Amino acid sequence: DVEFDALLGSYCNTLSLVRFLELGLSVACVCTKFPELAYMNEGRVQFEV
């Protein structure tokens, strides 16, 4: 007698790493890289219309 088991194949996907600038929503927002929010207390913005 011969009786064996067969792993006939293996499949995988990939985590499609979307990039937020490669995206239609990107002109809604000036996304700014400011690494110093941790030591920051507060910011303000004044407006002169």
Task: Match 């000036």 to its residue by tokens.
Answer: 30
Task: Name which of 14 and 46 has its Cβ closer to another protein.
Answer: 14
From residue 1 to residue 40, what is the string marking binding to another protein with x (rule CB under 8 A)? --------xxxx----------------------------
Q: How far is CA 13 from CA 9, 10, 34, 40, in A?
A: 14, 11, 35, 42
Task: Name which of 9 and 24 has its Cβ closer to another protein.
Answer: 9
CA distance 45 to 30: 15
Instruction: Return residues touching another protein (CB under 8 A).
Output: 9-12
